[PDB]
């Protein structure tokens, strides 16, 4: 049994958010919270949010038990970009792409027997 | 620097207006072409 999260369309670039997801991959639920607490990045807030909703779901929905929980796996995939114009000299005009993310977390229960 | 568009409403109406276009046979043809095309404005959009 595992619990699943998934936050879609978040509005931040994958390459940047991944940086902090790779931090907590495979750790007790307890440590993760503190890693994120004191990790100093915009993506903290986003990943924290998705890490909690996942664990609520474990306890509440699949009766899994808070204390046993850990990050079984996590990953962040890319969504569709927001295209925007940036005027230049000699009126030349480039296109800037505001990138976007789908963040995923899944918890498991450590040991059993 | 000062550029090419220097808007003046009297000027525009006297130059590209309806009454203007109907005075000259060439201006008459403009409309006739425009209408047959199904333009929604025969003359430049000007009011207040």
């Amino acid at each position: 049994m595992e619990a699943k999260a998934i936050a879609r369309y978040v509005r931040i670039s994958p390459r940047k958010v991944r940086l902090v997801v790779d931090l907590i991959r495979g750790k007790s639920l307890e440590e993760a919270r503190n890693i994120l607490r004191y990790t100093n990045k915009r993506g903290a807030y986003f990943v924290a949010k998705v890490l909690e909703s996942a664990a609520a779901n474990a306890v509440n929905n699949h009766d899994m038990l808070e204390d046993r929980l850990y990050v079984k796996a996590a990953y962040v995939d890319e969504g569709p970009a927001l295209k925007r114009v940036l005027p230049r000299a000699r009126g030349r005009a480039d296109i800037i792409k505001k990138r976007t993310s789908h963040i995923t977390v899944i918890l498991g229960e450590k040991h059993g027997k | 620097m000062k550029r090419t568009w220097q808007p003046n409403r009297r000027k525009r109406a006297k130059t590209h207006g309806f009454r203007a276009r109907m005075r000259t046979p060439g201006g008459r043809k403009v409309l006739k072409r425009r209408r047959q095309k199904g333009r929604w404005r025969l003359t430049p959009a000007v009011r207040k």
Partner: protein, 59 residues
């Protein structure tokens, strides 16, 4: 748009190879004494605080 410019598309492999050192660091933490919590050392932190010093609340 001007003088110097890349000769070739940088290959996926050499892209990622640049990034070997881009890896991150976990923040360094100690257990808040005089209270059950984690906190980064040499810091005052608001579940707790200090002694001959300022902090959150006391009623």
């Amino acid at each position: 748009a001007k003088h110097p410019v890349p000769k070739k598309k940088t290959s996926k492999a050499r892209r990622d190879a640049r990034r070997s050192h881009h890896a991150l660091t976990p923040p360094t933490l100690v257990p808040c004494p005089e209270c059950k919590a984690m906190k980064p050392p040499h810091t005052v932190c608001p579940e707790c605080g200090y002694y001959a010093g300022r902090k959150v609340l006391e009623v």
